[PDB]
């Protein structure tokens, strides 16, 4: 997920950087902006009024790129969120209940061969 | 829920589009704004200061439409969020704890018949 | 919780309304702003840059009122959130009936005594 | 250790209130003079609202040092927000069962060891 997110975060930093470096360099020159910017947009604050709507005055191409990135980041945010919910709830103390029962018996098999030792002790 | 949300998202894109296309076309001409806009307002960023308060300088009709949409979207956001919390939680190796205990005893019954058998095998 | 929240939402709509109606009526004249405003601040959007920081140029009294309201609303938001998590989450005695005469058996084998 | 992150967070909240206060008090006193701003500010930035357009980007016109300080603080606060959030999810999902299955099996055997010493004890025959 973190591996997977640092694909999305990385990929779209290369998408919008290669695209809007010509026109929107304040926001998308290189990663002195695109790494911040995508964090800023992932962080749902003045991302439309500050960035997306202004971008889409020039390029309606970015119509989805923003939207998808955010939809995609909010799907993989959730997955991380719930990725710890499931991981630390309920292999622990049930593989120490065979290590008692596997020689609960074993003990007996060498008692039963020690009764059969004085079963064999008549003849 | 996703089916249900793409009703709300769709319905209110038709509400505000049919309404504010006359006066507020920057935000509500057609779905070149209303699909974004509702996403933008659902995304709790410059949604009041950028949109709602300015809208309600002209139309106090939208007083609820915004609010309801958001209240409704935050109820159906939660439902999706918790919709996965319950679904992926919350009979296995307990039918191999009788297969040890069913001859834990069995063993003994042929030891006890070997105390009863070869104690009589005794003086 | 909903009953409890519509205290907080209501109470602070009466706090900031009775206070800033003199100076900040655009945001806090009556409930044509204070019910919205508190929803707007509860909704963590331009709430500081648009509202709080500007409010506190005049009144440093509101220093907490905003903060507390939000801290309080985020505590009672959580409680609602988790209030549904818990609400919709809806071999033992045959392993003593083997072990209670696993032994018993033995006690009448061990009483195999001269 | 269920509400022990609060101790840990009031380190981060405190530490970075001292970071940015000692730094930007010279240039950005509206936001970072002392804790009449830095305690609020960090709450404001932790609260993901106008934090870039209002604060971070403007700060980084003067100081590109704060490039991380903001980012880290937020990354760090969103990791310790989550931990608190999920810190209550697990804590209130509430028990005898399995410490009474060793109290039978620990003398299931014990019994036997004094039976085996009572087979062995009358082996002198």
Coordinates of C-alpha atoms in Angstrom, one line a residue:
Chain A
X1 CA 0.0 0.0 0.0
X2 CA 2.8 2.5 1.0
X3 CA 4.8 0.9 -1.9
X4 CA 1.6 1.3 -4.0
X5 CA 0.9 4.9 -2.9
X6 CA 4.5 6.0 -3.6
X7 CA 3.7 4.9 -7.1
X8 CA 0.6 7.1 -7.4
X9 CA 2.3 10.0 -5.6
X10 CA 5.4 9.5 -7.8
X11 CA 3.5 8.8 -11.1
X12 CA 1.2 11.9 -11.0
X13 CA 4.2 14.0 -9.9
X14 CA 5.6 13.0 -13.3
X15 CA 2.3 13.4 -15.1
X16 CA 1.6 17.0 -14.0
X17 CA 5.3 18.0 -14.0
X18 CA 5.9 16.9 -17.7
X19 CA 2.5 18.7 -18.6
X20 CA 2.1 22.0 -16.8
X21 CA 5.8 23.0 -16.5
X22 CA 5.3 25.2 -19.6
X23 CA 2.3 27.1 -18.4
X24 CA 1.9 26.4 -14.6
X25 CA 5.5 26.4 -13.2
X26 CA 4.5 28.0 -9.9
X27 CA 2.6 24.7 -9.2
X28 CA 4.1 22.3 -11.6
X29 CA 7.7 23.2 -12.7
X30 CA 9.4 20.2 -11.2
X31 CA 9.2 18.4 -7.8
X32 CA 9.9 21.7 -5.9
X33 CA 6.2 22.0 -6.5
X34 CA 4.7 18.7 -7.9
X35 CA 5.6 16.7 -4.8
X36 CA 4.2 19.4 -2.6
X37 CA 1.3 20.2 -4.9
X38 CA 0.1 16.5 -5.0
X39 CA 0.4 16.4 -1.2
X40 CA -1.5 19.7 -1.1
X41 CA -4.3 18.3 -3.4
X42 CA -4.3 15.0 -1.6
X43 CA -4.8 17.3 1.4
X44 CA -8.1 18.6 0.3
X45 CA -7.5 22.3 1.0
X46 CA -7.8 25.2 -1.4
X47 CA -7.0 22.5 -4.1
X48 CA -9.8 23.5 -6.4
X49 CA -10.1 27.2 -5.8
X50 CA -6.3 27.6 -5.6
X51 CA -5.3 25.0 -8.2
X52 CA -7.7 22.8 -10.2
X53 CA -10.3 25.4 -11.4
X54 CA -7.5 27.8 -12.4
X55 CA -5.5 25.0 -14.2
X56 CA -8.7 24.0 -16.1
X57 CA -9.0 27.6 -17.5
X58 CA -6.0 26.7 -19.7
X59 CA -6.0 22.9 -19.8
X60 CA -9.3 20.9 -19.6
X61 CA -7.0 17.8 -20.0
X62 CA -6.4 18.0 -16.2
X63 CA -10.2 17.5 -15.6
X64 CA -9.6 13.9 -14.7
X65 CA -5.8 13.9 -13.7
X66 CA -6.7 15.9 -10.5
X67 CA -10.0 14.1 -9.9
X68 CA -8.5 10.6 -10.6
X69 CA -5.4 11.3 -8.5
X70 CA -7.7 12.3 -5.6
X71 CA -10.2 9.5 -6.1
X72 CA -7.2 7.1 -6.3
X73 CA -5.5 8.7 -3.3
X74 CA -8.7 8.6 -1.2
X75 CA -9.1 4.9 -2.1
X76 CA -5.5 4.1 -1.1
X77 CA -5.8 6.4 2.0
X78 CA -8.8 4.3 3.2
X79 CA -6.9 1.1 2.4
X80 CA -4.0 2.2 4.7
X81 CA -6.6 3.4 7.3
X82 CA -8.4 0.0 7.3
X83 CA -5.0 -1.7 6.6
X84 CA -4.1 -1.2 10.3
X85 CA -7.7 -1.8 11.6
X86 CA -7.7 -5.4 10.5
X87 CA -3.9 -6.1 11.1
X88 CA -4.0 -5.5 14.9
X89 CA -7.3 -7.3 15.9
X90 CA -8.5 -10.9 16.3
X91 CA -1.0 -18.5 15.9
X92 CA -0.4 -17.0 19.5
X93 CA -1.1 -19.5 22.4
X94 CA -2.9 -22.3 20.4
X95 CA 0.5 -23.8 19.1
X96 CA 1.4 -24.4 22.8
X97 CA -1.7 -26.7 23.4
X98 CA -0.3 -29.4 21.0
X99 CA 3.2 -29.2 22.6
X100 CA 1.4 -30.4 25.8
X101 CA -1.0 -32.9 24.2
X102 CA 1.7 -34.5 21.9
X103 CA 3.5 -35.8 25.0
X104 CA 0.5 -36.1 27.2
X105 CA 0.2 -39.2 25.1
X106 CA 3.9 -39.8 24.5
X107 CA 4.4 -40.1 28.2
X108 CA 1.7 -42.8 28.3
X109 CA 3.1 -44.8 25.3
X110 CA 6.4 -45.3 27.4
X111 CA 4.2 -46.1 30.5
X112 CA 2.2 -48.7 28.5
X113 CA 5.5 -50.1 27.3
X114 CA 6.5 -50.1 31.1
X115 CA 3.3 -52.0 32.1
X116 CA 4.0 -54.3 29.1
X117 CA 7.5 -54.5 30.6
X118 CA 5.7 -56.2 33.6
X119 CA 3.3 -57.9 31.3
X120 CA 6.5 -59.5 29.7
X121 CA 7.6 -60.0 33.4
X122 CA 5.6 -63.2 34.2
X123 CA 7.2 -65.4 31.5
Chain B
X1 CA -24.1 2.6 -1.2
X2 CA -22.0 3.4 -4.3
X3 CA -25.2 2.9 -6.3
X4 CA -27.0 5.1 -3.7
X5 CA -24.3 7.8 -3.7
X6 CA -24.2 8.1 -7.5
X7 CA -27.9 9.0 -7.0
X8 CA -27.1 11.9 -4.6
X9 CA -24.0 13.0 -6.6
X10 CA -26.1 12.8 -9.8
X11 CA -29.4 14.2 -8.3
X12 CA -27.8 17.3 -6.8
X13 CA -25.8 17.9 -10.0
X14 CA -29.2 18.2 -11.7
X15 CA -30.6 20.3 -8.8
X16 CA -27.9 23.0 -8.8
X17 CA -27.4 22.8 -12.5
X18 CA -31.0 23.5 -13.4
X19 CA -31.1 26.3 -10.7
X20 CA -27.9 28.4 -10.8
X21 CA -27.0 28.0 -14.5
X22 CA -28.6 31.4 -15.1
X23 CA -26.7 33.3 -12.4
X24 CA -23.8 31.1 -11.3
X25 CA -22.4 29.4 -14.5
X26 CA -18.8 29.5 -13.4
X27 CA -19.9 26.9 -10.8
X28 CA -23.2 25.6 -12.1
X29 CA -23.6 26.0 -15.8
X30 CA -23.7 22.2 -16.7
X31 CA -21.7 19.2 -15.5
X32 CA -18.4 20.9 -16.7
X33 CA -18.9 22.5 -13.3
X34 CA -21.7 20.7 -11.3
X35 CA -20.0 17.3 -11.2
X36 CA -16.7 18.9 -10.2
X37 CA -18.4 21.4 -7.9
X38 CA -20.3 18.8 -5.9
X39 CA -17.1 16.8 -5.6
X40 CA -15.4 20.1 -4.5
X41 CA -18.1 20.7 -1.9
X42 CA -18.2 17.0 -0.8
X43 CA -14.5 17.7 -0.5
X44 CA -14.8 20.3 2.3
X45 CA -12.4 22.8 0.9
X46 CA -13.1 26.4 0.1
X47 CA -16.7 25.2 -0.3
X48 CA -18.3 27.9 1.8
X49 CA -15.9 30.8 1.3
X50 CA -15.5 30.0 -2.4
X51 CA -19.1 28.8 -3.2
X52 CA -21.9 28.6 -0.6
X53 CA -21.7 32.0 1.1
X54 CA -21.3 33.8 -2.3
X55 CA -24.2 31.7 -3.8
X56 CA -26.4 32.7 -0.8
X57 CA -25.8 36.4 -1.5
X58 CA -28.1 35.9 -4.5
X59 CA -30.2 32.8 -3.6
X60 CA -31.0 31.9 0.1
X61 CA -32.8 28.9 -1.6
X62 CA -29.4 27.0 -1.6
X63 CA -29.2 27.4 2.2
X64 CA -30.2 23.8 2.6
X65 CA -29.3 22.3 -0.9
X66 CA -25.6 22.7 0.0
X67 CA -26.0 21.8 3.6
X68 CA -28.3 18.8 2.9
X69 CA -26.0 17.5 0.1
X70 CA -23.0 17.6 2.5
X71 CA -24.9 16.2 5.4
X72 CA -26.2 13.5 3.1
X73 CA -22.8 12.9 1.5
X74 CA -21.1 12.7 5.0
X75 CA -23.7 10.1 6.1
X76 CA -23.1 8.0 3.0
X77 CA -19.3 8.6 3.2
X78 CA -19.4 7.2 6.7
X79 CA -21.6 4.3 5.5
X80 CA -19.0 3.4 2.9
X81 CA -16.1 3.8 5.4
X82 CA -17.8 1.6 7.9
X83 CA -19.2 -0.5 5.1
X84 CA -15.7 -2.0 4.7
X85 CA -14.8 -2.0 8.4
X86 CA -17.5 -4.7 9.1
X87 CA -17.2 -6.6 5.8
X88 CA -13.5 -7.7 6.3
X89 CA -13.5 -8.8 10.0
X90 CA -15.2 -10.5 12.2
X91 CA -14.5 -24.8 13.3
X92 CA -10.9 -24.4 12.0
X93 CA -8.3 -26.5 14.0
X94 CA -10.7 -27.5 16.8
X95 CA -11.6 -30.8 15.0
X96 CA -8.0 -32.0 15.5
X97 CA -8.3 -31.6 19.4
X98 CA -10.8 -34.4 19.6
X99 CA -8.7 -36.6 17.3
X100 CA -6.0 -36.5 20.0
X101 CA -8.4 -36.7 23.0
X102 CA -10.5 -39.6 21.6
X103 CA -7.5 -41.9 21.9
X104 CA -5.9 -40.1 24.8
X105 CA -8.5 -42.2 26.5
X106 CA -8.6 -45.2 24.0
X107 CA -4.9 -45.7 24.8
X108 CA -5.8 -45.9 28.5
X109 CA -8.7 -48.4 28.1
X110 CA -6.2 -50.9 26.6
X111 CA -3.7 -50.1 29.4
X112 CA -6.5 -50.6 32.0
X113 CA -7.3 -53.9 30.3
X114 CA -3.5 -54.5 30.6
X115 CA -3.5 -53.8 34.3
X116 CA -6.6 -55.9 34.7
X117 CA -5.1 -58.4 32.2
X118 CA -1.5 -58.5 33.6
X119 CA -2.1 -57.9 37.2
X120 CA -4.0 -61.2 37.0
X121 CA -0.8 -62.2 35.3
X122 CA 0.5 -61.9 38.9
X123 CA 1.3 -64.4 41.6
Chain C
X1 CA -24.8 11.7 21.0
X2 CA -27.0 13.4 18.3
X3 CA -29.0 14.8 21.2
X4 CA -25.7 15.7 22.9
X5 CA -24.2 17.3 19.7
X6 CA -27.3 19.4 19.0
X7 CA -26.5 20.8 22.4
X8 CA -22.9 21.8 21.4
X9 CA -24.0 23.0 17.9
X10 CA -26.9 24.9 19.6
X11 CA -25.0 26.2 22.7
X12 CA -22.0 27.7 20.7
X13 CA -24.5 29.2 18.1
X14 CA -25.8 31.1 21.2
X15 CA -22.2 31.8 22.5
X16 CA -20.8 33.4 19.3
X17 CA -24.1 35.0 18.4
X18 CA -24.5 36.9 21.7
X19 CA -20.8 37.9 21.4
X20 CA -19.8 38.9 17.9
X21 CA -23.1 40.2 16.7
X22 CA -21.8 43.7 17.5
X23 CA -18.6 43.5 15.5
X24 CA -18.8 40.4 13.3
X25 CA -22.4 40.3 12.0
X26 CA -21.4 38.9 8.5
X27 CA -20.5 35.7 10.4
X28 CA -22.3 36.0 13.8
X29 CA -25.3 38.3 13.6
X30 CA -28.0 35.6 14.4
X31 CA -28.6 32.0 13.2
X32 CA -28.7 33.2 9.6
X33 CA -24.9 32.9 10.1
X34 CA -24.1 31.2 13.5
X35 CA -25.8 27.9 12.5
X36 CA -24.1 27.9 9.2
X37 CA -20.8 29.3 10.6
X38 CA -20.5 26.6 13.2
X39 CA -21.3 24.0 10.6
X40 CA -18.6 25.7 8.4
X41 CA -16.0 25.6 11.2
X42 CA -17.0 22.1 12.2
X43 CA -16.3 21.5 8.5
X44 CA -12.6 22.4 8.7
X45 CA -12.5 24.5 5.6
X46 CA -11.2 28.1 5.5
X47 CA -12.4 28.3 9.1
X48 CA -9.2 29.9 10.4
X49 CA -8.1 32.0 7.4
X50 CA -11.6 32.9 6.6
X51 CA -12.9 33.2 10.3
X52 CA -11.0 32.5 13.4
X53 CA -7.7 34.5 12.7
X54 CA -9.7 37.5 11.5
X55 CA -12.0 37.2 14.6
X56 CA -9.0 37.2 16.9
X57 CA -7.7 40.5 15.4
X58 CA -10.5 42.1 17.4
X59 CA -11.4 39.5 20.1
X60 CA -8.7 37.2 21.6
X61 CA -11.6 35.9 23.8
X62 CA -12.6 33.6 20.9
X63 CA -9.2 31.9 21.1
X64 CA -10.7 28.9 22.8
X65 CA -14.4 29.2 21.8
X66 CA -13.4 28.2 18.2
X67 CA -10.8 25.7 19.3
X68 CA -13.0 24.1 22.0
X69 CA -16.0 24.0 19.8
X70 CA -13.9 22.1 17.2
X71 CA -12.1 19.9 19.7
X72 CA -15.5 19.2 21.2
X73 CA -17.1 18.6 17.9
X74 CA -14.2 16.2 16.7
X75 CA -14.6 14.3 20.0
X76 CA -18.4 13.9 19.5
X77 CA -17.9 13.2 15.7
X78 CA -15.6 10.3 16.6
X79 CA -18.1 9.1 19.2
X80 CA -20.8 9.0 16.5
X81 CA -18.4 7.3 14.0
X82 CA -17.5 4.6 16.6
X83 CA -21.0 4.8 17.9
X84 CA -22.1 2.8 14.8
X85 CA -18.9 0.6 14.6
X86 CA -19.8 -1.2 17.9
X87 CA -23.6 -1.1 17.5
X88 CA -23.8 -3.3 14.3
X89 CA -21.2 -6.0 15.0
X90 CA -23.9 -8.7 15.7
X91 CA -15.8 -27.1 21.6
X92 CA -16.1 -24.9 24.8
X93 CA -18.0 -27.3 27.1
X94 CA -17.2 -30.7 25.5
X95 CA -13.4 -30.4 26.2
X96 CA -14.0 -30.6 30.0
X97 CA -16.4 -33.6 29.6
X98 CA -13.4 -35.5 28.1
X99 CA -10.7 -34.1 30.5
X100 CA -12.8 -34.6 33.7
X101 CA -12.7 -38.4 33.2
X102 CA -9.4 -38.5 31.3
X103 CA -8.2 -38.2 34.9
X104 CA -11.1 -40.1 36.6
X105 CA -10.2 -43.1 34.5
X106 CA -6.6 -42.9 35.9
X107 CA -7.7 -42.5 39.6
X108 CA -9.3 -46.0 39.3
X109 CA -6.3 -47.3 37.5
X110 CA -4.0 -45.8 40.3
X111 CA -6.3 -47.4 42.8
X112 CA -5.1 -50.6 41.2
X113 CA -3.2 -51.2 44.5
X114 CA -1.9 -54.2 46.6
Chain D
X1 CA -1.0 1.9 27.0
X2 CA -4.3 2.8 25.2
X3 CA -4.3 6.7 25.6
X4 CA -0.5 6.9 25.5
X5 CA -0.1 8.5 22.1
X6 CA -1.6 11.6 23.7
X7 CA 1.6 11.9 25.7
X8 CA 3.4 11.2 22.4
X9 CA 1.4 13.7 20.4
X10 CA 1.8 16.5 22.9
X11 CA 5.5 16.0 22.2
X12 CA 5.1 16.6 18.4
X13 CA 2.6 19.4 19.0
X14 CA 4.9 20.9 21.6
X15 CA 8.2 20.3 19.7
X16 CA 7.2 21.8 16.4
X17 CA 5.6 24.8 18.3
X18 CA 9.2 25.4 19.5
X19 CA 10.7 24.6 16.1
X20 CA 8.7 27.1 14.1
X21 CA 8.5 29.6 16.9
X22 CA 12.3 29.9 17.3
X23 CA 12.7 30.1 13.5
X24 CA 10.0 32.3 11.9
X25 CA 9.4 34.7 14.8
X26 CA 11.8 37.2 13.0
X27 CA 10.0 37.1 9.6
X28 CA 6.5 35.4 10.1
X29 CA 5.3 36.7 13.5
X30 CA 1.6 36.8 12.4
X31 CA 1.9 33.0 12.3
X32 CA 5.0 32.2 14.4
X33 CA 5.8 34.9 17.0
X34 CA 5.3 32.7 20.1
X35 CA 2.5 30.3 21.2
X36 CA -0.2 33.0 20.7
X37 CA 0.2 31.7 17.1
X38 CA 2.4 28.5 17.0
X39 CA 0.0 26.4 19.2
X40 CA -2.9 27.6 17.1
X41 CA -0.9 27.5 13.8
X42 CA 0.1 23.9 14.3
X43 CA -3.5 23.0 15.2
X44 CA -4.5 24.9 12.0
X45 CA -2.0 23.0 9.8
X46 CA -2.8 19.7 11.6
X47 CA -6.3 20.7 10.5
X48 CA -5.7 20.6 6.8
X49 CA -7.4 23.8 5.9
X50 CA -5.9 26.8 4.0
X51 CA -2.6 25.5 5.5
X52 CA -0.7 25.6 2.3
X53 CA -2.3 28.5 0.5
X54 CA -2.6 30.5 3.7
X55 CA 0.7 29.4 5.4
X56 CA 3.2 26.9 3.8
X57 CA 3.6 28.2 0.3
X58 CA 3.9 31.8 1.6
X59 CA 6.4 30.7 4.2
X60 CA 8.4 29.0 1.5
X61 CA 8.7 32.2 -0.5
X62 CA 11.2 33.3 2.2
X63 CA 12.4 30.0 3.9
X64 CA 12.7 26.8 1.8
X65 CA 13.9 25.3 5.1
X66 CA 10.3 24.8 6.2
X67 CA 9.8 22.5 3.1
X68 CA 9.9 19.5 5.4
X69 CA 9.0 21.0 8.8
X70 CA 5.5 21.5 7.7
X71 CA 5.3 18.3 5.7
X72 CA 6.9 16.1 8.4
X73 CA 4.8 17.7 11.1
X74 CA 1.7 16.8 9.1
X75 CA 2.8 13.4 8.0
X76 CA 3.8 12.8 11.6
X77 CA 0.5 14.2 13.0
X78 CA -1.6 12.1 10.5
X79 CA 0.3 9.0 11.6
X80 CA -0.4 9.8 15.3
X81 CA -4.0 10.9 14.5
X82 CA -4.7 7.6 12.9
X83 CA -3.1 5.8 15.8
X84 CA -5.4 7.6 18.3
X85 CA -8.4 6.9 15.9
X86 CA -7.6 3.2 15.7
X87 CA -6.4 3.4 19.3
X88 CA -10.0 3.5 20.5
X89 CA -11.3 1.1 17.7
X90 CA -9.4 -1.8 19.2
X91 CA -9.6 -0.8 22.9
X92 CA -13.5 -1.1 23.2
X93 CA -14.2 -4.3 21.2
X94 CA -14.8 -6.2 24.5
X95 CA -12.7 -13.4 28.1
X96 CA -12.3 -16.5 30.3
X97 CA -12.0 -19.5 27.9
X98 CA -8.3 -20.3 27.5
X99 CA -6.4 -19.9 30.9
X100 CA -8.6 -22.7 32.3
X101 CA -7.4 -25.2 29.6
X102 CA -3.9 -25.2 31.0
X103 CA -5.2 -25.5 34.6
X104 CA -6.6 -28.9 33.5
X105 CA -3.7 -30.0 31.3
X106 CA -0.9 -29.0 33.8
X107 CA -2.2 -31.8 36.2
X108 CA -3.6 -34.0 33.5
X109 CA 0.0 -34.9 33.4
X110 CA 0.9 -34.2 37.1
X111 CA -1.6 -36.9 38.0
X112 CA 0.2 -39.3 35.7
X113 CA 3.7 -38.6 37.0
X114 CA 2.4 -39.8 40.5
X115 CA 0.7 -42.8 38.8
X116 CA 4.0 -43.6 36.9
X117 CA 5.7 -43.4 40.2
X118 CA 3.0 -45.7 41.6
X119 CA 3.6 -48.3 38.8
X120 CA 7.3 -47.8 39.3
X121 CA 6.7 -47.7 43.2
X122 CA 5.2 -51.2 43.1
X123 CA 7.8 -52.5 40.7
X124 CA 9.9 -53.8 43.6
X125 CA 7.7 -57.0 43.4

